[PDB]
Amino acid sequence: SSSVPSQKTYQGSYGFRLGFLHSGTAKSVTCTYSPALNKMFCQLAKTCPVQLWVDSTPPPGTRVRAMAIYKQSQHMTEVVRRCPHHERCSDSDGLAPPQHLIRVEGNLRVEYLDDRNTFRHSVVVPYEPPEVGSDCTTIHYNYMCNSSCMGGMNRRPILTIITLEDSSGNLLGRNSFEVRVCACPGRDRRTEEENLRKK
Amino acid sequence: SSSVPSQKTYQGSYGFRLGFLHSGTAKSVTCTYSPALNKMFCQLAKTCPVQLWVDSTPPPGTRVRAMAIYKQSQHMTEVVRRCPHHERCSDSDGLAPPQHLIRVEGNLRVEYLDDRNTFRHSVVVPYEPPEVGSDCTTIHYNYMCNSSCMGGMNRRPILTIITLEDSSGNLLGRNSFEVRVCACPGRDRRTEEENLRKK
Amino acid sequence: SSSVPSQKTYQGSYGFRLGFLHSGTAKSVTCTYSPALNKMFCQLAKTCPVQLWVDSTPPPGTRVRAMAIYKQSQHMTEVVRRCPHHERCSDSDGLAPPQHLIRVEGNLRVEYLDDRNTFRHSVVVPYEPPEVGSDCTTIHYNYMCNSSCMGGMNRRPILTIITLEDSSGNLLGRNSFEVRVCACPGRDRRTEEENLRKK
Amino acid sequence: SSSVPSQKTYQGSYGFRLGFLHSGTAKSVTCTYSPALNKMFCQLAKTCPVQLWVDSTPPPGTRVRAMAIYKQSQHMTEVVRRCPHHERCSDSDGLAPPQHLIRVEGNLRVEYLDDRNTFRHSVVVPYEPPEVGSDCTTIHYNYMCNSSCMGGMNRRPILTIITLEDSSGNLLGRNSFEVRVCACPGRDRRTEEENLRKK
DNA sequence: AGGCATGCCTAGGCATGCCT
DNA sequence: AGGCATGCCTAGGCATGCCT
Ligand SMILES: [Zn+2]
Ligand SMILES: [Zn+2]
Ligand SMILES: [Zn+2]
Ligand SMILES: [Zn+2]
């Protein structure tokens, strides 16, 4: 009955884990991931590659959902949406609704969904197994507002929750990670890791 | 026949206990809990996470009720309500009556009830067992007046009484805690703990 | 066209002036007037005597009106009225609307008015000339909220505007003074006068 | 033919001048005017008193119009309006259209106009002469976005253009001043004045 | 990439009905 | 009458997109 999706890591029967690319720590790198914070730092609308790893191939018709929630207890109830400014700027690829924060690029079967009870947005693609001789598949996500956007995330941290779901909407696996969308992900990742260390 | 609900701790057959998050002692932290005082300090309308722990899962259709009473003997008879100012400020989410002090956020099955004999307000949600691999569930409560509100709590301390109730309104368990809603929960928790020590 | 009454002092052709009584400035005197601040300090609902002085007798049917406005430019446009708690206190004399800040006591011809355009409150009594060998007439006003009332004056200072008006509605004279309604008028007068002299 | 209003000062035959109130330049004063910069610094939606001074009294039916234009040549052609977040905040008084930057408060005859050719917004009140023994009349303007609002003024300076216009629409006089709507008017005024003198 | 911007987070300290 | 309460005013300093 909670309207807040769970964020609990659940590797599940198929051994579901996420993977992220080692990037530069240059000031304005487009996407970078901090293991220490379990946090992705990225620029608005740039490609954020996320690897899916499983120990065993899930059943056919399995789906991959991405949803954002505010991380802080104080904001968890609020639906993460795009700010009014970016919602009106007609940057849609034709598939993604202007209100949705998370897009998937380069997938012909993407679906953008809206929970009729919680009003929360999400973007779903079918799960595909890796090519023979590869260990993972990679989804290219895009975040369409900055963390700081007035009237949107308004500087609040979010978590992206990725779930592996069988065809019948049951939970196969869940992982999550924090996201900051910002102008200078390298600077900001360095600042946050140093702040963690300093205090 | 008493119009004052009981505050007596009753762990009961299911081992019912409350839990609270460790928070900053920063001056204006939004919510903080003092074990020495069994007292929660929080800001008006901010999220107050309350954990529910049971040794054994209660029967289905079990419900979780929250009710406020004045803590002092001198005031226990008086129904705790919102002050006239906040009652008229049209801040309702559409579900909570403007008169009710305690709200629950993020729950699709919340009910706001009113005792026909005592006129006391309460807010109820269905009990849900923890997710597999978690020990507790968490309810997000909100207190919609400061303790100091003129015409309302008027600087008097309250207790929140959480009861675990079976489908047929029988008591399964009961816990309670003091609450101060205030502008600077960190300062005020330090002051009260130090006052306890000094005298 | 402006919805804010003028406060401009206008003694007019009848020589219209206000006077105040000397009051012992004990910490909690019921009412005291500071000439240096042109400001009255009084307790909620206590008698505030205000003297009407005039060089020439006004024509029959002259009336005396009192209105409150917020003193500061930031609040001028907001109608001065009672806070929600004192509005529902059921303390009307059967004549004053429960929302009106200013009442007149001890007058068989008092009338309370609501401006249909500005929605501002005022209280009118007929002007009576002094008795032979008296120099002035006194009106007894009551202020039915503290300056600090939440949802009412909310610590903002107000002016009382006293107008002398003939039966045809012409302005014959106007005077004003600041008001603080508070628990300890003698203390508060002393504190503001001190603050005045340290500027 | 130009869609940009003229800002050219024109006191005209009635000696039309603007005046401003002396304000205390605390860090967050609500409104302050810098004569050296001819610039008002004010907080979002707070009262900005603007004095209208005139040597000869304008004819009946004279109106006072306020419009905003971007100050820099690079932005002059762009209509000044509210950002998308604030346009959708539902903060109208029931009279100002939600898109208009400039409101007039406390006037029973305000009208909000959209130019059918340029689409620029303006707000108009009737001109009222000063009361006898008064030297000027004051309008209370409000600005409903910060200069920094994303998707609105976006940190670009604007000018407020005040025109005195007869009922037939003749220009009787024109004055203007720069505006910054910001969180800390006293600070920001100090900083820009400092920057001016280091040049 | 260096460094400014500017709303906003923070703590010190005052307020003011009210307790003693 | 003395002195505490407690929401909130004040100033310092950080944020973070963006200018140079
Ligand atoms: Zn955005
Ligand atoms: Zn309240
Ligand atoms: Zn009141
Ligand atoms: Zn805006």
CATH of the domain at D84: 2.60.40.720
Contact A32, A180 (CB under 8 A): no
Q: How many CA atoms lie within 13 A of D81 on its CB side?
A: 21
Q: How many CA atoms lie within 13 A of C136 on its CB side?
A: 14
Q: What is the DSSP letter of C10?
A: B
Cα-based angle B184, B187, B192 (whole degrees, multiple of 5):
115
The residue behind tokens 């399964």 is: B172
Cα-based angle A184, A189, A195 (whole degrees, multiple of 5):
125
Distances (CA, A) of C113 to B19, C100, C102, C110, C123: 57, 9, 11, 10, 6
What tokens appear for A198 in the block?
């300093």
User: Which phi and psi angles does A193 have, rounded to 5°?
Assistant: -65, -40
Give CA–CA dist C119/C69, Å, rounded: 12
Q: Starting at the earlier edge strand, list the strands of the sheet with C102-105.
A: C17-19, C48-53, C137-143, C102-105
Cα-based angle B5, B6, B11 (whole degrees, multiple of 5):
130
Q: How far does chain B reach from its first CA to its final CA, in angstroms?
A: 37
Q: Do chains D and B touch (3 or more CB pairs under 8 A)?
A: no
CA of C65 to C1' of E2 (A): 66
Tally B–C CB contacts below 8 A.
25
Give percent helix, percent strand, percent coil of chain C, each to the nearest 5. 10, 35, 60
What tokens appear for A160 in the block?
């992206």
Give CA–CA dist C162/C48, Å, rounded: 13
Distances (CA, A) of A57 to A10, A52, A124, A126, A165: 16, 11, 18, 13, 13
Cβ atoms < 10 Å from Cβ of A42: 24
What tokens appear for D61 in the block?
């039916």
Identify which of D81, D74, D67, D79 has the alpha carbon closest to the alpha carbon of residue D175. D67
At A100, the amino acid letter reads H
State the pairing for strand pair C31-34/B158-165: unpaired
Contact B175, B165 (CB under 8 A): no
Give CA–CA dist C193/C197, Å, rounded: 6
Strand extents, DSSP E, A16-116: 17-19, 31-34, 39-42, 48-53, 63-70, 102-105, 111-114
Q: How many CA atoms lie within 13 A of D69 on its CB side?
A: 18
The residue behind tokens 């400035």 is: C25
Full domain range(s) for residue A78:
1-199
Identify which of B27, B82, B17, B81 has the alpha carbon closest to the alpha carbon of residue B50. B17
Q: Chain D residue with minimal CA distance to C74?
A: D47
Contact B80, B69 (CB under 8 A): yes
How far is the centre of ligand 4, averaged over its atoms, from the C-alpha of D101 (Å)? Answer: 9
Distances (CA, A) of B40 to B70, B139, B191, C12: 14, 14, 13, 62
CA of B163 to C1' of E3 (A): 57
Contact A26, A186 (CB under 8 A): yes
At B186, the amino acid letter reads G
Q: Please report the resolution in angstroms.
A: 2.1
E12 C1' closest Cα residue: B27
Q: Starting at the earlier edge strand, list the strands of the sheet with A17-19.
A: A17-19, A48-53, A137-143, A102-105
Q: Do D83 and A88 touch (CB under 8 A)?
A: no
Cβ atoms < 10 Å from Cβ of B60: 10
Residues 6+ apart with CB under 8 A from B123: B65, B66, B96, B100, B102, B103, B104, B110, B111, B112, B113, B141
Q: Starting at the earlier edge strand, list the strands of the sheet with A121-126.
A: A31-34, A39-42, A171-181, A158-165, A63-70, A121-126, A111-114
Identify which of A39, A45, A134, A151 has the alpha carbon closest to the alpha carbon of residue A91. A45
Give percent helix, percent strand, percent coil of chain A, each to the nearest 5. 10, 35, 55
From the CA of B144, how many Å to the nearest CA of chain C? 15
Question: What does the radius of gyration of chain B's CA atoms come to, in whole angstroms?
Answer: 16
Give CA–CA dist B98/B82, Å, rounded: 8
Give CA–CA dist C79/A60, Å, rounded: 68
Ligand positioned closest to the Cα atom of A84? 1
Give CA–CA dist B23/B44, Å, rounded: 17
Selected residues 4-63 of chain A with any CB under 8 Å from a CB in chain D: none
User: Which phi and psi angles does B29 have, rounded to 5°?
Assistant: -50, 145
Give CA–CA dist B188/B40, Å, rounded: 10
Residues with CB under 5 A from ligand 3 (ion): C 83, 86, 145, 149, 152
What is the tally of structural domains in chain C? 1
Ligand positioned closest to the Cα atom of D84? 4
Scanning chain D, the segments in alpha helix (DSSP H) are: 84-87, 185-197
Give CA–CA dist D42/D40, Å, rounded: 6
Give CA–CA dist D12/D171, Å, rounded: 9
What tokens appear for D153 in the block?
């003024």
By residue count, chain A amounts to 199
Identify which of B187, B185, B157 has the alpha carbon closest to the alpha carbon of residue B7. B157
Give CA–CA dist B3/B138, Å, rounded: 29
Cβ atoms < 10 Å from Cβ of C18: 19
Cβ atoms < 10 Å from Cβ of D59: 13
Question: With a 7 Å cutoff on the CB, does D45 touch strand E?
Answer: no
Contact A108, A100 (CB under 8 A): no
Give CA–CA dist A34/A42, Å, rounded: 11
Q: Do B149 and C150 touch (CB under 8 A)?
A: yes
Give CA–CA dist D93/D91, Å, rounded: 7
Contact A72, B29 (CB under 8 A): no
Give CA–CA dist B110/B102, Å, rounded: 12
Cβ atoms < 10 Å from Cβ of D120: 17
